[PDB]
Amino acid sequence: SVYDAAAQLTADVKKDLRDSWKVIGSDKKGNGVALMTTLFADNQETIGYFKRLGNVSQGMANDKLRGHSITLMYALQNFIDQLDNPDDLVCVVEKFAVNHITRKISAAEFGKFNGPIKKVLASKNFGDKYANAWAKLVAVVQAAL
Amino acid sequence: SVYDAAAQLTADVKKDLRDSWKVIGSDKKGNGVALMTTLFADNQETIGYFKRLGNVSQGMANDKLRGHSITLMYALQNFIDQLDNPDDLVCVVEKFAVNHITRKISAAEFGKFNGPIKKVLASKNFGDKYANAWAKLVAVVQAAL
Ligand code: HEM
Numbered sequence A, B: 001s002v003y004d005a006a007a008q009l010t011a012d013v014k015k016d017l018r019d020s021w022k023v024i025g026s027d028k029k030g031n032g033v034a035l036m037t038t039l040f041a042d043n044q045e046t047i048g049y050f051k052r053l054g055n056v057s058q059g060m061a062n063d064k065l066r067g068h069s070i071t072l073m074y075a076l077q078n079f080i081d082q083l084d085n086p087d088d089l090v091c092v093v094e095k096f097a098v099n100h101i102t103r104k105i106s107a108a109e110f111g112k113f114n115g116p117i118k119k120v121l122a123s124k125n126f127g128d129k130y131a132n133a134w135a136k137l138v139a140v141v142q143a144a145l
């Protein structure tokens, strides 16, 4: 149930999500690229999925990777904005899952994003409290896969 | 060239885009669905493209349509935010284009979106000048199709 998953987004969790996003979402180009490069560095087994992006080791200088990273940050923007209404959050999460599902991506695959998110957050001085909050959001996407 | 197209986005055009977006982009759910509904109302032949969404006449009540409409607005948000750096605008546009090219959406068909945009702008008191500004942004995407 994706609804039961969304219900775990309590007042405090939502507050921490916003407070952290106020900072990481301000530099979508930079932090988006950071998230992606960290993903490829900690989980080399995932690179195969982004073959179209060329050499992802170039990072910021890779136009395709940059385009992807910025856009990815807008999916996160989308979720944060829907936190006030669980009904809308679920429909966007599910809309979002469709493309990943067709790519044969599984829930176990998505769980690998918690590491990168946690590391980026820490580089911006956001501790475990925030990493946990973001894991709850990711869990919502997982329940939809 | 997508770059050449981006040149049409002069200072005055960019200003008209931001100003109007501050309004239409502030109610993504409501304005997103209005855009889609208008498209289906004026271009019935496009309904077949969205079979996944189901019965699109259900409007706001169609969760699938709502999720898509809200997400559609974040792509536009992405474009607006990259206006001052064509290098970034270009890579997000090309990235965005990928999925629409696979669906066989031609440049001419993409242009069918100028009608809905013009009408939603009008409904919020933004005239011809703003519509023409938005048609230029659309032209940038058409340059990638
Ligand atoms: C919070 C986690 C994630 C977010 C917010 C996210 C976001 C996005 C967005 C917005 C797109 C572009 C639209 C689309 O085609 O769907 C996308 C594309 C893609 N995603 Fe994800 N994604 C996430 C996790 C993953 C994971 C875990 C994988 C891999 C196992 C994955 C694989 C892909 C691939 C291969 C593409 C297409 C890349 C391209 O060809 O340009 N995503 N993702």
Ligand code: HEM
Pocket (backbone or CB within 6 Å): A099, B046, B049, B050, B052, B053, B068, B071, B072, B075, B076, B099, B100, B103, B105, B109, B110, B111, B112, B113, B138
């Ligand atoms: C300003 C114009 C448009 C924008 C910004 C836009 C935006 C989007 C976005 C963001 C998605 C979902 C995310 C993704 O695919 O990665 C999407 C999906 C799609 N778009 Fe567009 N689009 C536009 C015009 C059109 C037009 C003119 C057509 C065809 C008449 C079209 C056909 C589709 C189709 C078939 C899908 C898949 C829908 C689904 O099954 O969920 N789009 N579009």
